[PDB]
Amino acid sequence: EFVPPPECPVFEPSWEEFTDPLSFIGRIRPLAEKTGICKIRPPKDWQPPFACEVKSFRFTPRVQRLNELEAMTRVRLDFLDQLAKFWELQGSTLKIPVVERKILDLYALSKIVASKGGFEMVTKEKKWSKVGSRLGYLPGKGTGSLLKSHYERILYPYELFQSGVSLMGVQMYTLQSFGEMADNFKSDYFNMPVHMVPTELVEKEFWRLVSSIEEDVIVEYGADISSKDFGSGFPVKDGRRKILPEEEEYALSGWNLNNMPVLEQSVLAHINVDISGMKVPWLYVGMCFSSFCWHIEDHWSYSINYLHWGEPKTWYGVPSHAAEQLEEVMRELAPELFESQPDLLHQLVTIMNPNVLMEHGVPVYRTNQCAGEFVVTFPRAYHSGFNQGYNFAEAVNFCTADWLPIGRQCVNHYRRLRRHCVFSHEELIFKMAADPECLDVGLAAMVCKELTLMTEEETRLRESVVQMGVLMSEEEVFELVPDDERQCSACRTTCFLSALTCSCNPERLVCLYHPTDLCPCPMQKKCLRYRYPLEDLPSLLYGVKVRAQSYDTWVSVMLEDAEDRKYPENDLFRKLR
């Protein structure tokens, strides 16, 4: 019944193309960009050895019930819809909390609390830990009594309202053993050897199972697994190990996902300035039917995903230019609700059958990722998928010159939601501007383009605030204050260039796009806490415009200055030799 979408392009580079990954990825960009995702087959000789011992690799499995795997079911949405309207009536604007790294499933929570007699029943029986169990929350971190606090604050009043009339007060595992599991499950399921069931058939059954209430099917996986803690699946030189000479090659390869963030063309390659969460790969142990939902990368960045070993991983991809279109159809499922909670759209995990997106006009492509192949994801390319079988994968994010203006647009969009920021885009650009040499020429060029656009937009914001009637101008070093303190009262964007403070609160901030929402205290007194006194315009645009317009002229001892300034060498250095 399920209709496979068209396949995304594969790329089989030569050994020479394969030597500089990010340059090879900029070559295929104009083409792969249009499918959102794409597959990459390294030379068949290229076979890095798996660094990890499977027999002693202990991970805690998470679990998936493909029936309740879709969160945007009619019932859950209408519940949140009504619950929001309830809190509007009371004049208090539903605020959905976060528990153990992800949003609280209130619908599930009220269903369960109600199924065992309601809030006070569950309290006077102390079954709040059982609740958090059935909600999948990992014990015994105390979540039981954390839910009670939330239920009471948010759901008990609705429980009463929804209840009778009832309102008067108050208010305001081993990798080894895991393979045994997986292979046994798959064979018992299809009554075949695992390596013998065809891909197309698993694909058909998966999407069946998502919408089937007629039967329940549970599955286990592993994720939220840092290389930092568990170790990378690649060899790397960090003192943990003598690296064998058989491996030396692969420890240095730019396709080793531990080296990608640091390559000369990566944005983070020199900013030893902030833990961005992704300079460090993540591991994904997979099982038949294990799945990941539709998502885009934080700050709309690239993802690259290597399947170390195992059975294939199925993907689905959507080009960036269809991203606004993709979100639009998901929003159709509860427009009123997503009005009040714009970012709730992304917080809510979904596997929308690709067919559905296609019959709504959304381009969708697909591929089977096989052991030893890469998958690349392009900025704002939604993607999802499921595993054909037991396998093991490793992934990073990364950012390139061509991403810088997308990153800037992404903050503008996070700002127009109420979405936190993993880092300050503007800070990133200055940290790059503050080391113009040894900075890939492309970036430099792009930085200038991007930095001038910000000097403008800032000075506009800087001049607009003096009319409003602020006088004093303190000067602060934002990068040295923790993110959570330099965020905006209501944006909530990490401020770096400039923000507004007043004396009502010792430290409660607002970005310059929202200067009214700081505090009723009139603008009469200060304060525009800034970072540079508009004496940056000459300085920093210079160092970059230097290395930007030094390469412009150099092309128009010459082969020496390119070696000193660390220039690139594809067609231009070729003509040298």
Ligand X SMILES: CC(C)c1cc(C(=O)N2CC[C@H](n3cc(Br)cn3)C2)[nH]n1
Q: Which does 317 bind (CB under 5 to 8 A by kind): Zn ion, ligand X, Ni ion, none?
A: none
Least Cα distance to 208 among 365, 2, 366, 383 occurs for 2
Q: Is 297 labelled as part of a ligand binding site?
A: yes
Q: Which does 338 bind (CB under 5 to 8 A by kind): Ni ion, Zn ion, ligand X, none?
A: none
Nearer to ligand X, 219 or 509 (CB): 219
521, two tokens: 């205290």
Give min distance, CB of 537 to Zn ion, in A: 23
Q: How many residues in the shown chain lie near Ni ion by CB under 5 A?
A: 1
Nearer to Ni ion, 290 or 498 (CB): 290
Angle of helix 441-467 relative to helix 425-433, nearest 10 degrees, comes to: 120
286 close to 219: Cβ distance less than 8 angstroms: no
Whose CB is nearest to Ni ion?
Answer: 303
Nearer to ligand X, 41 or 566 (CB): 41
| Vertex 527 angle, CA 521 and 530, to 5° | 150
**DSSP state at residue 371:** T
Give min distance, CB of 557 to ligand X, in A: 44
Looking at 435-535, list the stretches that DSSP marks H as alpha helix, in order from N- to C-terminal side.
441-467
Give contact residues for Zn ion (rule: CB under 5 A). Answer: 488, 491, 502, 504, 511, 513-514, 519, 521
Question: What distances in angstroms separate CA 455 from CA 442, 447, 461, 539, one per listed residue?
Answer: 20, 12, 10, 12
Least Cα distance to 75 among 107, 106, 46 occurs for 107
Nearer to ligand X, 8 or 433 (CB): 8
Q: Is 221 labelled as part of a ligand binding site?
A: yes
303 lies in the site for Ni ion, by CB under 5 A: yes
Give min distance, CB of 379 to ligand X, in A: 12
Q: Which stretch binds Ni ion (CB under 5 A): 133-141, 158-166, 295-303, 479-487?
A: 295-303
Give min distance, CB of 472 to Ni ion, in A: 45
Least Cα distance to 365 among 345, 344, 381 occurs for 381
Distance between CA atoms of 426 and 532, rounded to whole angstroms? 12
Q: Which does 418 bind (CB under 5 to 8 A by kind): Ni ion, Zn ion, ligand X, none?
A: none
Give strand ranges (E) for 22-130.
37-40, 62-65, 98-99, 102-103
Distance between CA atoms of 176 and 254, rounded to whole angstroms? 29
Q: Which does 201 bind (CB under 5 to 8 A by kind): Zn ion, ligand X, Ni ion, none?
A: none
DSSP letter string, 404-461: HHHHHHHHHHHHHTT---SS-HHHHHHHHHT--TTS-HHHHHHHHHHHHHHHHHHHHH
Distance between CA atoms of 518 and 503, rounded to whole angstroms? 10
Give min distance, CB of 257 to ligand X, in A: 9
Nearer to ligand X, 35 or 498 (CB): 35
Q: Which does 504 bind (CB under 5 to 8 A by kind): Ni ion, ligand X, Zn ion, none?
A: Zn ion
Give min distance, CB of 11 to ligand X, in A: 19
Give min distance, CB of 396 to ligand X, in A: 5
Q: In 43-72, which positions are buried (b, 16+ CB within 10 angstroms) versus exposed (e)?
A: eeeeebeebbeeeebebebeebebbebbbe
Distance between CA atoms of 37 and 365, rounded to whole angstroms? 8
Nearer to Ni ion, 234 or 294 (CB): 294
Give strand ranges (E) for 429-571.
498-500, 510-511, 528-530
Nearer to Ni ion, 394 or 458 (CB): 394
Q: Which does 38 bind (CB under 5 to 8 A by kind): Zn ion, ligand X, Ni ion, none?
A: none
Nearer to Zn ion, 363 or 407 (CB): 407
Nearer to ligand X, 288 or 396 (CB): 396
Q: Which does 521 bind (CB under 5 to 8 A by kind): Zn ion, ligand X, Ni ion, none?
A: Zn ion
Q: Is 503 labelled as part of a ligand binding site?
A: no
Q: Is 457 labelled as part of a ligand binding site?
A: no
Q: Which does 397 bind (CB under 5 to 8 A by kind): Zn ion, Ni ion, ligand X, none?
A: ligand X
Distance between CA atoms of 122 and 134, rounded to whole angstroms? 14
Give min distance, CB of 265 to ligand X, in A: 18
Give SS3 for 363.
coil
Give min distance, CB of 511 to Ni ion, in A: 28
Distance between CA atoms of 23 and 55, rounded to whole angstroms? 38
25 close to 310: Cβ distance less than 8 angstroms: no
Q: Which does 395 bind (CB under 5 to 8 A by kind): Zn ion, Ni ion, ligand X, none?
A: ligand X
Q: Is 346 labelled as part of a ligand binding site?
A: no
**DSSP state at residue 153:** I
Give contact residues for ligand X (rule: CB under 6 A). Answer: 223, 278, 282, 284, 286, 292, 297, 303, 305, 383, 385, 393, 395-397
The binding site for 2-oxoglutarate comprises 221, 303, 305, 313
Cite the annotated binding site for Fe cation by residue number. 295, 297, 383
User: Rule CB under 5 A: which residues touch Ni ion?
Assistant: 303
Residues annotated in a binding site: 221, 295, 297, 303, 305, 313, 383
